[PDB]
């Protein structure tokens, strides 16, 4: 019969054996397994999205993106397992390189040297350069989506919230609901942004850099608008110019209603940090998304000078441009991995 783990069919044999639980998500579970063809342990992500349109959409987007992308700092797909027919297919399993840990686990337990922070940040941005060069936004960058091997090589995972960039349709009203993880949300999400521009990811990287410096999330809000309280509590009140860029009256008037808040100096929050790291941090955690540093400028920043080499920071060859129909497309998209 099929192998099980945490009372849950893990139907991946005979190729993949000797399973141990790794982690989970909203509509599935990840295990490690032994690959009998390649003779190595691998990660296997079980996905069961077919009852929800939204989960089907996220599954399809993630599979399509990861199959197109090939980058050292981006998790790949080595294999996909599913039943031979639509009707026998209850689940999709994605086989990926097994990693030792993630940055979330590491930050709970380990002081990072400045050389580690520097190198981790370099790899994040190198992966993000490729992602953004493909006209794609990750939209949920956070420590638990950054995987590490035993020699600290880094891979970005979880493209379930990724979208093609759409900056001409980014505007929305004040307090519009948003799906991505709260602590890593850029201020404009809460004000007037759908999170359809590359600047949303730079903000999340800025939060990740801050968290590497102190082992604590920099903006740990407890609810939708508290997230913005935390941001402004450190950045201080927005400038007149930055306020004038927010044409939406509810968002503008909300900000104008708040008492003046002073900027907290980065070197007060992070008194042992490298001053170059804090200069890049400042640039990534800029309130105004138009003034926020872009990925290729971040890579070129003095903090990263030991690693910066644009000839070794590749870009994508081929950038990107109900529920029942979504299911057929997942069946189609996974066909190339089956026997026959
Ligand atoms: C020991 C660990 C670090 N090794 C490891 C972990 C992963 C991995 C860590 N996370 C994911 C992932 O894709 N997780 C998302 C949730 O973020 C998810 C999982 C299930 C269902 C849904 Cl719908 C979404 C894969 C890899 Cl690929 C290799 N080695």
From Swiss-Prot:
Phosphothreonine: residues bearing it: 176, 181
**What does the UniProt record report as the effect of altering residue 309 to A in this chain?**
Loss of dephosphorylation by PTPRJ
Describe its PTM?
Answer: Phosphorylated upon KIT and FLT3 signaling. Dually phosphorylated on Thr-176 and Tyr-178, which activates the enzyme. Undergoes regulatory phosphorylation on additional residues such as Ser-237 and Ser-239 in the kinase insert domain (KID) These phosphorylations, which are probably mediated by more than one kinase, are important for binding of MAPK1/ERK2 to importin-7 (IPO7) and its nuclear translocation. In addition, autophosphorylation of Thr-181 was shown to affect the subcellular localization of MAPK1/ERK2 as well. Ligand-activated ALK induces tyrosine phosphorylation.
Residues modified as Phosphotyrosine are 178
Q: Which residues carry this modification: Phosphoserine?
A: 20, 237, 239, 275
Q: What InterPro entries does the database record attribute to this sequence?
A: Kinase-like_dom_sf, MAP_kinase, MAP_kinase_CS, MAPK_ERK1/2, Prot_kinase_dom, Protein_kinase_ATP_BS, Ser/Thr_kinase_AS
State the Gene3D superfamilies in the record. Phosphorylase Kinase, domain 1, Transferase(Phosphotransferase) domain 1
Q: According to its UniProt record, where is this protein located?
A: Cytoplasm, Cytoskeleton, Spindle; Nucleus; Cytoplasm, Cytoskeleton, Microtubule organizing center, Centrosome; Cytoplasm
Q: What is its EC number?
A: 2.7.11.24
GO BP term, pick one: regulation of cellular pH
- What outcome follows a substitution of residue 309 to N? In NS13; results in increased MAPK signaling; increased translocation to the nucleus; reduced interaction with DUSP6; no effect on interaction with MAP2K1
Changing residue 178 to A has the effect of: Inhibits interaction with TPR
Q: Which family does it belong to?
A: Belongs to the protein kinase superfamily. CMGC Ser/Thr protein kinase family. MAP kinase subfamily.
- What pathology does the entry list? Noonan syndrome 13: A form of Noonan syndrome, a disease characterized by short stature, facial dysmorphic features such as hypertelorism, a downward eyeslant and low-set posteriorly rotated ears, and a high incidence of congenital heart defects and hypertrophic cardiomyopathy. Other features can include a short neck with webbing or redundancy of skin, deafness, motor delay, variable intellectual deficits, multiple skeletal defects, cryptorchidism, and bleeding diathesis.
What is the name attached to this protein's record? Mitogen-activated protein kinase 1
| Organism, as annotated | Homo sapiens
